[PDB]
Symmetry: C4
Subunit: 25 residues, 4 copies
């Protein structure tokens, strides 16, 4: 388990990469 602020940051970062990929595609 992780600090909630770390889990969030991890969610934010994954979604960021997903969005970037979909925008480039």
């Amino acid at each position: 388990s992780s600090d909630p602020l770390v889990v969030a940051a991890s969610i934010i970062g994954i979604l960021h990469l997903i969005l970037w990929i979909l925008d480039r595609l």
Copy 2:
């Protein structure tokens, strides 16, 4: 909970994205 260095890195990363968004807006 997380290593303090991970919590910080998570803070740094969130603030980085926030600043980037506000700069682009």
Copy 3:
């Protein structure tokens, strides 16, 4: 130890930087 979603995000981020470096090289 970390939340599995954090470990993944960490893997994703490391691989992302690796790929970016190899693409620029």
Copy 4:
């Protein structure tokens, strides 16, 4: 505490931002 792979990724990410800032400055 965190998974060692997460602590590393956090180190990698902080150093990455540091280097980027110093390169832009």
